[PDB]
Amino acid sequence: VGQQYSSAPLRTVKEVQFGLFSPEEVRAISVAKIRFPETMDETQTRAKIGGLNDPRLGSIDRNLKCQTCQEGMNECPGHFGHIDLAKPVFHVGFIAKIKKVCECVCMHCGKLLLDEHNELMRQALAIKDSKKRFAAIWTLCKTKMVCETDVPSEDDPTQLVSRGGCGNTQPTIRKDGLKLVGSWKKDRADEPELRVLSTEEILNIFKHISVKDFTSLGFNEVFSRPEWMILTCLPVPPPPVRPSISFNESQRGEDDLTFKLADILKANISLETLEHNGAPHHAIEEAESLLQFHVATYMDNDIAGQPQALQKSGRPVKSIRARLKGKEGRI
Amino acid sequence: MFFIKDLSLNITLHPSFFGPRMKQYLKTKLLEEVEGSCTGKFGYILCVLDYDNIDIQRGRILPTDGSAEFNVKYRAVVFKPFKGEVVDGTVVSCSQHGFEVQVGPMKVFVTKHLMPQDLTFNAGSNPPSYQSSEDVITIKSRIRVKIEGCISQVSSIHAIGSIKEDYLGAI
Amino acid sequence: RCSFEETVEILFEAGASAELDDCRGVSENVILGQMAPIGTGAFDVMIDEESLVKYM
Amino acid sequence: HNQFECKGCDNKIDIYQIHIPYAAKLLFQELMAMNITPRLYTDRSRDF
Amino acid sequence: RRRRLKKVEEEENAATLQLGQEFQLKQINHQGEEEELIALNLSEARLVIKEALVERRRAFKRSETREKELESIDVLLEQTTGGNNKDLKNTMQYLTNFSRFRDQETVGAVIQLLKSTGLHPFEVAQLGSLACDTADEAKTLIPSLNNKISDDELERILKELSNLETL
Amino acid sequence: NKDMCPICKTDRYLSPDVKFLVNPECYHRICESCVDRIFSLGPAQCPYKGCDKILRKNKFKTQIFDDVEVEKEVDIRKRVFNVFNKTIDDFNGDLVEYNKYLEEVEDIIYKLDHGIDVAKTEEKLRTYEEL
Amino acid sequence: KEKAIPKDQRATTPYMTKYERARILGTRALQISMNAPVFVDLEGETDPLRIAMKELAEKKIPLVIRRYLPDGSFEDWSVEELIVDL
Amino acid sequence: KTELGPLIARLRSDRLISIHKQREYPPNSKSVERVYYYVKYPHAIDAIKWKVHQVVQRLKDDLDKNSEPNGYMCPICLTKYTQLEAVQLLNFDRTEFLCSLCDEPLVEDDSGKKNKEKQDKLNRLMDQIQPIIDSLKKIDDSRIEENTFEIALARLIPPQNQSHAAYTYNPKKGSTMFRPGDSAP
Amino acid sequence: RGPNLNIVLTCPECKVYPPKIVERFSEGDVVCALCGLVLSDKLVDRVGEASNPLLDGNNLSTRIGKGETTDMRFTKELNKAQGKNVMDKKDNEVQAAFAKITMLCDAAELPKIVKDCAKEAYKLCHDEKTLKGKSMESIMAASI
Ligand SMILES: [Zn+2]
Ligand SMILES: [Zn+2]
Ligand SMILES: [Zn+2]
Ligand SMILES: [Zn+2]
Ligand SMILES: [Zn+2]
Ligand SMILES: [Zn+2]
After folding, report:
1. Is E163 helix (H, G, I), strand (E, B) or coil?
2. What is the number of the ligand closest to the CA of F32?
3. What is the dihedral of CA C22, C27, C33, C39, to 10 degrees?
4. Whether residues B104 and B159 fall in one domain
5. Range of the domain at F12
6. How are strands ordered across the β-sheet holding I38-41?
7. What phi, psi does D36 have (nearest 5°)?
8. Between 20 and 30 A from A133 (CA), which of A237, B160, D32, I81?
9. Is A260 helix (H, G, I), strand (E, B) or coil?
10. In Å, how far from its chain's centre is CA D38?
């Protein structure tokens, strides 16, 4: 038979513009808000509205239509839902990148630790390619442990020219698990101060980095901002990406992605209910860590030093990264 | 509103028309695929001006289709509706959900809520008509309508009009 | 580059760096299922009206 | 109904159809799940 | 050409003369020469359309009151146009029953009349398509005319427009 | 009736962009926000308690004087002076006739402002327009 | 059109390449299979590929090859003017 | 605790109450972290001003929306159609508006009569919310100083004779560590 | 009470309803048995996990365990956090009952069908007003 005729012009892909999803875009693209960690209603006859297999995200059955485009399985590309996360979480694939940006900017005003008043940074900013410019900037800024409200002038070092600063000592940032922990070193008069850098705190800082500042770090004003490396709204892939197989067709199985997406929802609702009423900070932090772990393992289940998400049979859950990599992956 | 627009189209020729008179076929295709067609970006393409001097560029053979793709530049008269514009037309259909006014190649739909309060629908009279103390609106009647909204699809345009404002309605 | 090794790491860096792929390589066209600009694809085939009129 | 729409962009007249392998569609959607935006464009913005 | 993502666009609205992206005042033709937006009133549009049909009829062959003109246009339409002309038939029928200027001389006078105001092409085309008796009618039927032309000029322009009305 | 629209109760403190307008027909203050929603589609009755005089959005203007009563008198004065308009030279320097003419015009304005004899006075304004 | 090199300064080979011949024969063979007008006399032949070969031998293929350059410019070469020596 | 939790949490989300955690070292007990609650007036006033504005704005917008044409809905699939969207679905007879998914006649929507009720709601709210507007006007004239745990301690009225919590602020020496939102102008 | 969203395969040409339809699985085709017209092509025939929606209903859950490289600290705390979920607490009671039923049925040398029926009987008869003053041992023994 083939696919139906279309009035749209037929074209060839000329360019591919990679980038990061903004939380606003994920909500605008979304056709439905996923709020129930189930797949079928209490009768197990139809898909639950608002659940994982919402009929609005598409159809993977030859006998049902998509509630959005009213087309069969072989024409519906699939439609994305979204889950609004209770608290921001890191992207497991950008934590190292997020850490490097944190060491480059001030963690209280979001300004690059070294301005154009420094000769070495002037050479660094003169590098054309984004990647090596970022490496040069990081090599210079990661050792600057202060914001330097006033900096020596470039005409002579006699008088100081003022620059936007705050004078707060920068911390030494290290990656412990899926958290970023900073340590402040004391003054003349013991053990350094230590506390955890909250994802909300880091998101707030990354939203203050100026356009010219993170373009120097290799980010794009329109397609990739450092603020978007922190996940606030999660895109929910359509069923085509996570189809439900049948072995005897009297038994029903769900994709590993659906299992993890249900975990994210359950962890999300648990965090919402906790922080809504009472919830001493210890309980909240535990819930946030669970939400972070589920999202991280939903995307990549092979993380150094972390536990692995396991099906009830005990085998590792197949993540999106596992599907794209290897001799048998998508590519 | 009627505009004279400079338009471009991509025409496809089946290999059966790769003869010594293929330019004539391209002209025929243009008049058969463009004239009378509706585009949400340019409105209704009504007439092609200077039918003798269309610019036919070199055609590209499609890899697997085998057909030639010609870019064609032409000058056409196109009717494009705009919200907030006032037009005149003739009523073609009447129903409980209001009447429809025919303005050139476009049909404007006037909803009850966009009509004056005094007007009321009377299905008893044949044909059905909207009756008020001063005037009667029926099929073939002439109505001055102000387009209140326009929804343009890639191959269709639908508009809603109103006759509530002054100097509107029956002419 | 993602076709050889470190597929996901390369794609994440492409997203964070907002890399533009112009699809001039064989791998990009293979992924997109379109004729690569190689061999029989290193040129375009156009139709000649000037010769069509004189071939009759 | 011969209707197209990309909600979020609020457009109905700037649509194109492309022929790609279904695995390529699957790949891009998986990248979308990973918060990556592979944006396919039918015209060039930079010269060779 | 640089990046492009969602930008806030001025919603189309005739009252504000915000005609959109493809119907801007300054247009570019196929030769790259700058030109003004060509907006036609009903009478001008009627003449332009039927002027091309006669030329089209001449191409193939070589190689008045309302009713008779309506029939003449109808027979010419069917002869000189291809299939799926359901829209053009309504257009020609609509233009003959709603036009105020019959011949070229009448239309030419209108064009030489309304170009002295310096109004937008959309506004002048509207003033030649709608019959308004008072300056107030044209100020409300064409909200854009507000604070562009004084009532003194509009009153006389409407009088002269109604002057050259055949039948 | 201090700084807020009597209809929508949009105080100036929470909406500093608020701007009021008046309609000569009834001289009722109304913020621009209410004007668009109540009158954009077409003519409608004034949205005031006790006022049933229809008006159009195109007629709204900005109040010049802070006193509403003076605004009414001035606007009527402008309407009359657009019709009843002469100069001292119109009577060939006859000051007595000119002063009597001025007094008559003031009497006309006074009657139109306070509605003493609306019908007869209004007809007189229309009549003199021909002459 | 700055990317269309004028015919007087074309610097590409005046010879048809093997890939150009393969696509031209396949391109014209596909057109013949779709009932395209044949500009060569057939002394008895039903295979579209053989008909295309006859047309190429007698230089009756109304196509031009747009050879692209690594900077985006191109040259237009008619199948009739290209030498088929390989 | 299970009842004070929801109260503290909500008064914290709206920033009517601020929290302060500090380590305490009783001379004869295990070191414990104590939690204190106070009011940061600049923070609370901004929250009040924003919420007052938003509530009025939402009602005003609802008044604007409710004054617009009604629309349409499909009884079966419960999908709303606007006046413009419904005009491209009407049948060939130009008699009824047909749904796209269900191919069923559409039913006119509600909100036609609420034109007066929404205005009544706004009339009531501005009367009830009057004291807040009057108080905010007087606050803007003056300049309020931002409060801190130490500053608040200057006005402390001790609750109990022998409270275990030491109502004192002895900051750590030479501590360059800066916590979020722990400094005031 | 919901959108139809049903696809029925019928031959446009034959027009006979209901139609004779043959599924050429080897060829991946759905063809009209009378005229031979193909009605749908490219029909479809570890990446997921199985579950029984008769004893567990709709409940997708995932365990946390060690990998090839893992620190015991993260595993212990993540399990600690996961246990303190309020929604999953309700069904864990049923699952705990299933575990003890399985233990009893296994210590009795009973076939798998017996324990499946026992667990199903428990689920159907549980969460009802009649069996609220009775000990769980009586419920389990009766279900077995
Ligand atoms: Zn769909
Ligand atoms: Zn700083
Ligand atoms: Zn108001
Ligand atoms: Zn009033
Ligand atoms: Zn429906
Ligand atoms: Zn059949």
Report:
1. helix
2. 3
3. 90
4. yes
5. 4-59
6. I21-24, I29-32, I38-41
7. -90, 145
8. D32
9. helix
10. 8
Start-to-end CA span in chain G (Å) = 33
Q: Report the domain count for chain B.
A: 2
Q: Do B69 and B47 lie in a common domain?
A: yes
Domain boundaries, chain E: 1-39, 40-167
Cβ–Cβ < 8 Å for A235, A29: yes
Sign of CA dihedral E116, E122, E125, E131: negative
* D9 annotated to bind ligand: yes
Q: Over the Cα atoms of chain B, what is R_g? A: 21
Length of chain I: 144
Confirm or deny that D45 is annotated as ligand binding: no
Backbone angle region of C39, left / alpha / beta, with phi > 0 → left and psi within -120 to 50 → alpha? left
Breaks (C-N over 2.5 A) in chain D follow: none
| H11's tokens | 């008064």
Say if D7 is an interface residue toward chain E (CB within 8 Å): no
Way it was determined: cryo-EM
| C-alpha H104 – ligand 5 centre gap (Å) | 6
B129 with B138: CB under 8 angstroms? yes
Residues on chain D touching B153 (C-beta within 8 angstroms): 2-4, 12-13
| I120: amino acid identity, one letter | E
Contact A102, A198 (CB under 8 A): no
Which residue from I31, I32, I29 is spatially nearest to I15, judged by alpha carbons?
I32
What's CA A291's distance to the chain center, in Å? 12
3-state secondary structure of E47: helix
**Whole-angstrom distance, CA of residue I20 vs CA of residue G7:** 64
> Distance between CA atoms of I138 and H173, rounded to whole angstroms?
66
What residues have CB less than 8 Å from H1, skipping those under 6 apart?
A: A278
Q: Which of C39, C37, C41, C43 is nearest to C23 (CA)?
A: C37
- Residue A16, chain E, CB below 8 Å: the answer is no
PDB resolution in Å: 2.9
Both B160 and B87 in one domain: the answer is yes
Beta strands in H4-79 (DSSP E): 18-24, 32-38, 72-73
Interface check for B151 against chain E (CB to CB < 8 A): the answer is no
